[PDB]
Amino acid sequence: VGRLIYTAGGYFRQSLSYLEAYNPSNGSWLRLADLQVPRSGLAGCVVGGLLYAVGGRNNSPDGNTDSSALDCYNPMTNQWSPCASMSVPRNRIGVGVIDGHIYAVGGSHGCIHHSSVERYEPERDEWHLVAPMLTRRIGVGVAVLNRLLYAVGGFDGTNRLNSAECYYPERNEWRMITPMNTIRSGAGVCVLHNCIYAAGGYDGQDQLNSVERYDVETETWTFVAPMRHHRSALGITVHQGKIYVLGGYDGHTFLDSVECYDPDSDTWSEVTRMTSGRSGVGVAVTMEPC
């Protein structure tokens, strides 16, 4: 196969423009073309072999500019291309892909906490708003299972949330699901087998090392083995049936730690370190550059 874990942007003292790719097969890191604009609180995703960086903000010494940007990285060219901008800036965004379409979920613009959701069509290079969430959510976790979109936890500006909701695309409708056992803002949210996982995040007191998973058949959340490191604002992705969490913040350090969850053994292990500690990255998986 030859797939890599791509980490784009993130935060250490200011927003970063780094694009770096980890190869699970050999433990190597490649530095690739920098983002055109520094970004943190962005999400990453892949459609048709292309890496997309969505939303976030540029938190610089001179400014905090919330991002409406969609930018596309082609591993074949090692080049970033601007795409159509979203309706609204969305810092601390959540993203998921259904049937080749990018869903942009919630996030902040200054003191505004979005419930709005919009869907990108890569071939037409267009965004359109779809039904808003039932809840204003920033730092929201998003994943896709069986062509249904899940929005998990976050922050409404008053309360960190344990709530979650599911979007039924054929009905353009959101419905609440069972809440998580734990309040989580800025958790890593991904799908593995028939479950939605929520790893780490921030409960309004501490960065979390707990991980819980939602079984879509049974509609329950169950804790699994905790991560070795407490982390908020972590990157997450799935590669060859294992969860990878990248960086984040433990209340003391910007982590370079990358941990890997094996669902067969219910254990986490340390598999590599990023080249530098950072939080708020976008992460996704695709083919290695040329």
């Binding site: 935060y11 927003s15 938190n59 604002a233 209340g251 708020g280």
Partner: peptide
Amino acid sequence: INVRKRNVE
């Protein structure tokens, strides 16, 4: 009431 600590983006 809650807190947040350092900046994370």
